[PDB]
């Protein structure tokens, strides 16, 4: 079906925040059912990753709405919490870059797991605090029952 070069174009557009050409693409040129399968060449990062890291809340909400509408509930959960080769969720990137609006959207409405641990052993909770993004970190500590471990 959908080749690498066109998967790249789709996620470069998520990165840029061109929501206009995104709706364009998924109403006419590609099935919205396939949005959840577009992954970058090198990283395996999804379009959710790109939009999330860049704080494009409207693009992020669209991506989520579309995936939710076009896929099973199981497929939606597996998408929001999808990890790249380095083991990072979109949430991880959003927390590193301190994008609060995206984070509340991911965790409140679409129930993202901030406890997923990457190849280095870090979860979104760590990443937020490690990049001095205190607003995102304080949100995590209110929202979830976060304690130290073994």
């Amino acid at each position: 079906p959908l080749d690498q070069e066109d998967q790249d174009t789709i996620i470069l557009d998520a990165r840029a925040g061109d929501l206009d050409s995104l709706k364009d693409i998924f109403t006419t040129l590609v099935s919205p059912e396939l949005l959840s399968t577009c992954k970058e060449s090198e990283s395996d990062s999804t379009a959710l990753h790109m939009a999330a890291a860049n704080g494009h809340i409207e693009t992020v909400r669209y991506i989520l709405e579309t995936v939710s509408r076009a896929n099973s509930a199981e497929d939606l959960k597996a998408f929001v919490n999808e990890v790249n080769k380095t083991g990072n969720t979109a949430l991880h990137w959003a927390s590193l870059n301190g994008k609060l609006d995206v984070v509340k959207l991911l965790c409140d409405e679409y129930e993202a797991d901030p406890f997923i641990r990457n190849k280095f052993g870090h979860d979104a909770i760590f990443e937020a605090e490690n990049s001095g993004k205190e607003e995102v970190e304080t949100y995590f500590l209110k929202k979830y029952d976060v304690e130290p471990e073994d």
Partner: protein, 187 residues
């Protein structure tokens, strides 16, 4: 300026490529046909390496991974303190937490979790003041939270101080005695 994806991907690359060089994070600025990436680590001697050996290797290996043409990026280095081992940073962090409506216990937990995950041997947080209601206005509290701090033998320590008037000036005396537990053990 560089976008959040770039920061994220740089962070992925470097955490793996600089595993034992005590990699902290990265700053990045973009200029007229030049792109600057400042690497921050605990020790910059391993990073710069033998006459920029490790630097120039990275700089080219970065071109191949991020598809920059040669001469469009350059790598810098700065020594910074590890954030999770910095008492100063965590106290400031705790200050932020408290000022934004986070319960003391939850704030303490956050910091303690971060510091241990950062590889400390032990962490202690203490918050003090009028933390709860009391009839005496001068009554103050302290909630402490700790992982791996102190020995059982610290609970066998008594101290006294005296204040003595001498010709040369006033002297302070402090005496600490740690009792032997093996002399008070039952039976």
């Amino acid at each position: 300026v560089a976008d959040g994806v770039f920061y994220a991907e740089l962070n992925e690359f470097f955490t793996r490529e600089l595993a034992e060089e005590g990699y902290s994070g990265v700053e990045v600025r973009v200029t007229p046909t030049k792109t600057e990436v400042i690497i921050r680590a605990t020790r910059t001697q391993d990073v710069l390496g033998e006459n920029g050996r490790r630097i120039n290797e990275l700089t080219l290996l970065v071109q191949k991974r991020f598809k920059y043409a040669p001469g469009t990026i350059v790598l810098y280095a700065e020594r910074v303190q590890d954030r999770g081992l910095s008492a100063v940073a965590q106290a400031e962090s705790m200050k932020f937490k408290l000022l934004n409506g986070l319960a003391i216990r939850r704030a303490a937990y956050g910091v303690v979790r971060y510091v241990m995950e950062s590889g400390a041997k032990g962490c202690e947080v203490v918050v003090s003041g009028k933390l709860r209601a009391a009839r005496a206005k001068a009554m103050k509290f302290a909630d402490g939270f700790l992982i791996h701090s102190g020995q059982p033998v610290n609970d066998f320590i008594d101290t006294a101080t005296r204040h003595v008037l001498m010709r040369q000036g006033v002297l302070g005396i402090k005496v600490k005695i740690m009792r032997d537990p093996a002399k008070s053990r039952t039976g």
